[PDB]
UniProtKB/Swiss-Prot annotation, chains A, C:
Function as written in the Swiss-Prot or TrEMBL entry: Involved in the biosynthesis of isopentenyl diphosphate (IPP) and dimethylallyl diphosphate (DMAPP), two major building blocks of isoprenoid compounds. Catalyzes the conversion of 4-diphosphocytidyl-2-C-methyl-D-erythritol 2-phosphate (CDP-ME2P) to 2-C-methyl-D-erythritol 2,4-cyclodiphosphate (ME-CPP) with a corresponding release of cytidine 5-monophosphate (CMP).
Protein name: 2-C-methyl-D-erythritol 2,4-cyclodiphosphate synthase
UniProt: 4-CDP-2-C-methyl-D-erythritol 2-phosphate binding residues: 10-12, 36-37, 58-60, 127-130, 134-137
GO biological process terms held by the UniProt record: isopentenyl diphosphate biosynthetic process, methylerythritol 4-phosphate pathway; terpenoid biosynthetic process
Enzyme Commission number, as recorded: 4.6.1.12
High-level lineage: Bacteria, Pseudomonadati, Pseudomonadota, Gammaproteobacteria, Pasteurellales
CDD domains: MECDP_synthase (cd00554)
Subunit details: Homotrimer.
Reaction catalysed by this enzyme: 4-CDP-2-C-methyl-D-erythritol 2-phosphate = 2-C-methyl-D-erythritol 2,4-cyclic diphosphate + CMP
Organism this protein belongs to: Haemophilus influenzae (strain ATCC 51907 / DSM 11121 / KW20 / Rd)
InterPro entries in UniProt: MECDP_synthase (IPR003526), MECDP_synthase_CS (IPR020555), MECDP_synthase_sf (IPR036571)
Co-factor(s): a divalent metal cation
Pathway participation: Isoprenoid biosynthesis; isopentenyl diphosphate biosynthesis via DXP pathway; isopentenyl diphosphate from 1-deoxy-D-xylulose 5-phosphate: step 4/6
Length: 152, 153, 152
């Protein structure tokens, strides 16, 4: 095949840290889900979609790790090894947040830079669940992504 | 490109409008989320998928009215064609805790086919449920997901 | 059309059975959502995406059923009739579960069998919502699917 389709969905649950004094020593205390990444839901979903289209599994098969751009580049390199380049990708951030549009083009530029394609092959959008569900109650954010790969 | 893929997702939270008498004056009172559209979740998601495939952003850039979602849809298509694209095909998945909609599906398909100037055979619409789970399952609103494939005409 | 795109989304709410004695008679008692299938969200989502790409509606139009592979093969038969073959498929299982990777390849093989394609054209990945939402609270599981059909 010379054309592949892929999809990704990722969630980041909010969590917080606070200092505690126990036994005369200060220890950090984490509340909520324990993160093993910067929580970049947009890049994680995109990574899964690109790996997915090439049938390379998912983010959980890259480094058998925190910075998502590093994972994203690793996924693109693996898709290159198989002979693919980016046709185009589309990202949909699902978050109960207002202004993120001012940063949208900055996100596109970096993604384009990491996928070695033009910024015009990258689309990013943000929408809300209108106060509904876990994103609506602001317990976390999610993201959905689709990717089209083309044979080089 | 010669072929582009796009994705859209949208949610409509239920709200209610009731008349009230305050200060001797009749006034409208809105309960729930304040909509700024007709709440057409299927057309909103579809509109975002087509703009997304062409890298035109999202529905929130079509008109810097919104009461009618078919207008926004046509406007998105107008812009997509301006970049040289026509519809390859689209598939829409309505997510709602509801039953009978099939009688209405084909009618939806025709309207969409018309606004995208394509054949109905290029437009698919389906409805599924979350089996009573989540916000759609608890009947607090509805959602919709959509994917689109654009081609150079 | 030479290329077709499709999307699928399915959810399976948990339900358990309980034997009871009523009127001196043993009768099974069901708790929760009454299932009408094997609850396979992966094959159901996939089925919807394959039919959806060919504009054949959804899985609820196949046999006017306790085995999702039967339904999947039937779905492929109908798309096959319209002159389509599988380009590639990508499945994203959403569940608050861990060890599923050991079973993912086995799933890919079964899917590759019912779609009469190579396993290289089938991708299955699994992710969680980080304890959030209905899947995060373990009330059920969900699945997202996309499919690319090509004129055979």
């Amino acid at each position: 095949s010379l054309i592949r389709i892929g999809h990704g969905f990722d969630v980041h649950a909010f969590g917080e840290d606070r200092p505690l004094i126990i036994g005369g020593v200060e220890v950090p205390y984490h509340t909520g889900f324990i993160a093993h990444s910067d929580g970049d839901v947009a890049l994680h979903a995109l990574t899964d979609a690109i790996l997915g289209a090439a049938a390379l599994g998912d983010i959980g098969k890259l480094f058998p790790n925190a910075d998502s751009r590093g994972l994203l580049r690793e996924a693109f390199r693996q898709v290159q090894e198989k002979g693919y380049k980016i046709g185009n990708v589309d990202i949909t951030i699902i978050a109960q947040a207002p202004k993120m549009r001012p940063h949208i083009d900055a996100m596109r530029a970096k993604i384009a830079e990491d996928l070695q394609c033009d910024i015009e092959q990258v689309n990013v959008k943000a929408t809300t669940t209108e106060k509904l569900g876990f994103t609506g109650r602001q317990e976390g954010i999610a993201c959905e992504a689709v990717a089209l790969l083309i044979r080089q």
